[PDB]
Design a protein around this ligand. Structure first.
Ligand SMILES: OC[C@H]1O[C@@](CO)(O[C@H]2O[C@H](CO)[C@@H](O)[C@H](O)[C@H]2O)[C@@H](O)[C@@H]1O
Ligand SMILES: OC[C@H]1O[C@@](CO)(O[C@H]2O[C@H](CO)[C@@H](O)[C@H](O)[C@H]2O)[C@@H](O)[C@@H]1O
Ligand SMILES: OC[C@H]1O[C@@](CO)(O[C@H]2O[C@H](CO)[C@@H](O)[C@H](O)[C@H]2O)[C@@H](O)[C@@H]1O
Ligand SMILES: [Cu+2]
Ligand SMILES: [Cu+2]
Ligand SMILES: [Cu+2]
Ligand SMILES: [Cu+2]
Ligand SMILES: [Cu+2]
Ligand SMILES: [Cu+2]
Lengths: 345, 345, 345
C-alpha cells in the first residue's frame, strides 16, 4: 500500500559517503539499501595485531546511509551462511521494535527486509543487537555504523541561514577489547566464538586496548589521509556506538557543531573540542583556512597517540600569514636574556 | 517568622513519584519532607550478590522530591540509632552551607531539620556528604536521590509552548564497587565498616563492578517493567551522583531533553542518546508512538547488558506500520542472489 | 608589515590571572607573552609524593593568557638548556600548523617566536605536542594551560545583556599517572626520561593515580583557599587538556555556564554540575549569595576526595536565613516518633 518511487542506493566504504543531494525538491521516496554481515579476521593496529571482527558490509564502521526527512528506508539485511552467529540491526533513527532489532534477527543463511520512516533529522548510530550480552559483544566487535537524515532543505545554522558542505567524511570510532596473554602480548583466535570468553573479561573492565578510526590504527594517516582544500566547508560525521569520544581538529575548529547530532537543534559555533556520547553520532562543519597537515583526534591524547585514534587531513592551498606566522625561527637563547629573574624561578 | 502554609508530602519508593501538580496557582508553601537513613545489606544483582548499602528511606536511589519554584523545602533528616555511622544531606538545588551538608551532620540516634528555598528550577541530585573520603563512600554505597523543582507554570519547550507529562518515572543510576576475592568472586561483609577498606581499593581504580537502576540489576525488567501507553508523554528523570551516564530509549527518542537538567534552559529536541554528567540529574520527555517492549539503558552497552544497567518499558497500544514494518520476514537468501559481487568482498 | 601597537603582558601563577580589561575600546594590538619550559620534580599530593613534571613557566597548569578578539598574540617560547627534551606549543585558539605546534619545536637551548591571530572567542587549552607518543606524555606531565579570548565588549548572557565579573580564577585540572612498585607505593625517578617507560604503562590503562587542581592535592585548600565576598560575580575558568571533568561548586551553582567554553554561544543558566570535555576549557560565572566555605570539585567524588580534586572558596559576608536555615539543630529522635511505620521498613 505504500505507493512511493523506489530508489536503490549503492553504499561505499567509509570514510567516503555515497552520493546524495543536500537540499532536494524531490518528494519522499523508498530508499533501498542492502547490508551484508561479514564476520572475518581483521588487522587493527600498526604492529599487525589481528582481531575477530564482525561487520556490516566488511568495514568498521559500517557504511554511512544518507536519506532525507520523510523518506522511508527499506533495508535488506543479509546474514550469509559463511557466518557463524545470528545478527540483527537497530537504527537509532527509527521508531519502534527496539529500533528494528526485534524485527530483523536472522540466522546464517537468512535475510530480512525492514522498512522505517525517517521522521527524525540528524546523524544516528545503527548497530547489531541480538539480545543480552551479545549486544555489547557484537557492537564492540565492529557491528555499528551511522545513518544521516538530512532536512529536505539541507543543513542550516539554526539562525535561518543555509549551510552547504563541499565535502563529507564519516569517521567511525571503535573501542576494541583484545585479550592479552600472561606476557602482555595480544592473543589471536580462530573464530569469534573462540575469542568470546577472554574478550568479555576485557570488556568487563571497561578499558579498551585500542581506539581506532575506520577500523585500524593508522587507517586514515599516511597514504589514506583525508583530502581537502583551503576554502572548502567539510562536514565530519563522527559516531561511537558504545563509548564516549571528544573529537578535535588539531589546527582547526568546529565552525558549526551538532555534538548531540540532531539537526532540529541549532549547532554551537567555534568549538575547540566536542563530545560524542557513546551510543550516538554527531557532526561538525569546518571551513579550512590554512593548508597543511591536520590531525583529527579524540582529545584523550593517550587514546589518540597510543591506542590508535588519530586521522590526518592533508589540505592544499596557500598559507595565510595573517592568521599565523613564525615570526622568528628556532634560534639559540640570546646570551643577554634574563630568564633567571622570572617570577616562577 | 516564615509565615507560609505548611504541606506534608509522603514520599514513595522509586521509580514512582509522589503525587504533585505540574502547573499550580498555589502560592509558595513550606513543603515538609522526612528522610530516614537506613544502613542495610541489599541484593544488587541477578546472581544474588549482596552489598553493604546505605540509603535514604531504604531505597537506591532515595525518593524523588517534587516542589515548585519559590517553595521552601523543610527536610527532617533522621539517623536511627540502629545505624553505625554519622550522615548528613547536601541538596544540589539549595544555596549555602555545602548544599545543607554543613548544617545536617547527625550521629545515630539524632535528627535535624533543614530548610532551603527552591530558587532554582530543574532536577537536581541530593546526597550524603559527611566529610573527606566518607563523601564518595556514602554516595556510592547508595546515599543519593534527586529533587525536582518545577516552574509554577509547569514545563515548557523553551519556545513558549507548555509541555505536560501523563506519567513520570525516576531512574536513579548507581555505580557500585564490590570487592572480589583472589578467585574473582564477590566478597560479603557483615557491616559497612568491615567492607570499607576493600571497597575503597576498588573505588580508587574508578571502574564499577555493577551499574544499576533502582538499586539492582534487573530491578526494572521482568514483572517490574515500567508501564506506558501509546500516545502518553512520559517524563524520565535520570540521576547519577558520582559518575557519567548516557541514557538511551531503545526504539524511541528523547523528544525534549534537558540533559544538564535545568528548566531555565530550552531542551534539545529529537535526541538519540543524552548525557548525565556525574553529580547531576537530567530529564527527557518522550511521547510513545509504538507499543511493545523498550529497553532503557546507559549506552555503554557493556554497562547496560553486563553490569546491570537496563530497564524495560512495556507499552500497550496499536502498532503503526507506517513508522516501521517488517516488509519480509526472515527467509533463506535467494539462490539467485549475487552478493559475491559486492564492493567489499 | 603588521603595524599595530605592541603590549607586553607579564603572566602570573595560577589560579590568579594577569590584569586585563573586560570590555575595551582599544583597537587590536600585538600582545606579547613569554613562556619558558621548566622540567622539574614537583610534589603532587599531601603525602609528599614527587613526580617528574614538565611545565610552562614552572606551574601546573601553565598560566592563563588573556587577550581580546582580533588581537594578535606573539608568544616567545623558550626551552632552556637545563631541560632535557624538545618542546613546542599548540594553541587550540589558533588556526593552522597544528595550532602552532608545527612551527614551535625547539631543542634545549633554543627559543622560537609564534604569532597567531585571536579570531575565535572563548577559553581554550594550550599544550605541548612534540609528536607521536610524546604528545600525551608531555601533556600529562604538566605541559598545558589555557588562553581566554574575550569579546571586545566583554562577556554577555547570550540574550543581549552585559555580564561583568568582579573576580576571576583559573582552575587547571591535571590527570597524573604515577607508577607504583610491587608493594603499591609510588615510585620516584631522577629524571623524566627515566620515568617514561613505567609511566607510559600506567597511561595505557587510562586510569589516573591523581587528579589535581593547580598541580597538587590540597593546592587550593587550607591557606590557599580562593577568596570571595557575598555579592561578587566570580568567573571560574576550568581546563582539562587530556581527560573529561565535571565541575561542581558545592553549596553554589553555575549562574551562567559555557561548558564548551566559547563565547559566541549563549551560556546555560543555573547548572548544578557542568562538563569539561578533555582537550578543552570551559567557564562558569557565579554570584555568591552566602558566606562560608565552598568546595569546588569534579563530581566524580572519588576523584574529588580520594585522588586530589578539591578546591575551596572562603567567602566573607552575612548569612541569608531566607535561602537556607537550620530550623532545628541535631537532637535526639523524639521518644514519641513513629518511624517504624514508614512505607520502606
Ligand atoms: O499486542 C499485540 C501483539 O502484536 C504483536 C504480535 O507479535 O506484534 C505487533 O508488533 C510488531 C512489532 O513489534 C509488529 O510487527 C506487528 O505487526 C504488530 O501486530 C506483538 O508484539 C503483540 O504481543
Ligand atoms: O562569620 C560569622 C560566623 O557565623 C557562623 C557561625 O557558625 O554561622 C553563619 O553561617 C551558618 C551557615 O553555615 C548559619 O547557620 C549561621 O546562622 C550564620 O551565622 C560561621 O559560619 C561564621 O564563622
Ligand atoms: O605547499 C607549500 C609548502 O610550503 C611550506 C614550506 O614548509 O610552508 C607553508 O606553511 C607553513 C606553515 O605550516 C608556513 O610557515 C609557510 O610560510 C608556508 O609557506 C610547506 O608546508 C608546504 O609543503
Ligand atoms: Cu551481530
Ligand atoms: Cu543502540
Ligand atoms: Cu551517609
Ligand atoms: Cu554533590
Ligand atoms: Cu613538552
Ligand atoms: Cu590539543
Amino acid at each position: 500500500d505504500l505507493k512511493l518511487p523506489r530508489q536503490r542506493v549503492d553504499l561505499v566504504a567509509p570514510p567516503f559517503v555515497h552520493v546524495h543531494e543536500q537540499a532536494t525538491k524531490q518528494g519522499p521516496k523508498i530508499m533501498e539499501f542492502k547490508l551484508v554481515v561479514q564476520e572475518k579476521k581483521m588487522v587493527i593496529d600498526e604492529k599487525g595485531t589481528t582481531f575477530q571482527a564482525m561487520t556490516f558490509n566488511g568495514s568498521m564502521p559500517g557504511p554511512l546511509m544518507v536519506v532525507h526527512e520523510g523518506d522511508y528506508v527499506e533495508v535488506t539485511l543479509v546474514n550469509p551462511a559463511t557466518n557463524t552467529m545470528p545478527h540483527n540491526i537497530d537504527f537509532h533513527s527509527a521508531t519502534g521494535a527496539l529500533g528494528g532489532g526485534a524485527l530483523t534477527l536472522i540466522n546464517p543463511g537468512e535475510q530480512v527486509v525492514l522498512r522505517w520512516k525517517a521522521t527524525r533529522t540528524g546523524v544516528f548510530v545503527y548497530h547489531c543487537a541480538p539480545g543480552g550480552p551479545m549486544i555489547p559483544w557484537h557492537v564492540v566487535s565492529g557491528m555499528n555504523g551511522a545513518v544521516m537524515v538530512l532536512p529536505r532543505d539541507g543543513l542550516n545554522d539554526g539562525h535561518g541561514h543555509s549551510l552547504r558542505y563541499d565535502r563529507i567524511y564519516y569517521i567511525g570510532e571503535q573501542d576494541l577489547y583484545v585479550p592479552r596473554d600472561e606476557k602482555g602480548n595480544f592473543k589471536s583466535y580462530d573464530s569469534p566464538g573462540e575469542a568470546y570468553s577472554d574478550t568479555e573479561e576485557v570488556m568487563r573492565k571497561l578499558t579498551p586496548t585500542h581506539v581506532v578510526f575506520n577500523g585500524k590504527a593508522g587507517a586514515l594517516t599516511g597514504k589514506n589521509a583525508l583530502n581537502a582544500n583551503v576554502g572548502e566547508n567539510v562536514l565530519i560525521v563522527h559516531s561511537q556506538a558504545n563509548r564516549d569520544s571528544r573529537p578535535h581538529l588539531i589546527g582547526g575548529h568546529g565552525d558549526y557543531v551538532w555534538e548531540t547530532g540532531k539537526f532540529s537543534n541549532a549547532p554551537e559555533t567555534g568549538l575547540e573540542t566536542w563530545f560524542i556520547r557513546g551510543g550516538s553520532a554527531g557532526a561538525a562543519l569546518y571551513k579550512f583556512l590554512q593548508p597543511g597537515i591536520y590531525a583529527y583526534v579524540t582529545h584523550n591524547l593517550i587514546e589518540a597517540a597510543n591506542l590508535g585514534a588519530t586521522a590526518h587531513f592533508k589540505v592544499e592551498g596557500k598559507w595565510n600569514d595573517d592568521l599565523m606566522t613564525q615570526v622568528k625561527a628556532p634560534a639559540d637563547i640570546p646570551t643577554g636574556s634574563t630568564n633567571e629573574n622570572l617570577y616562577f624561578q
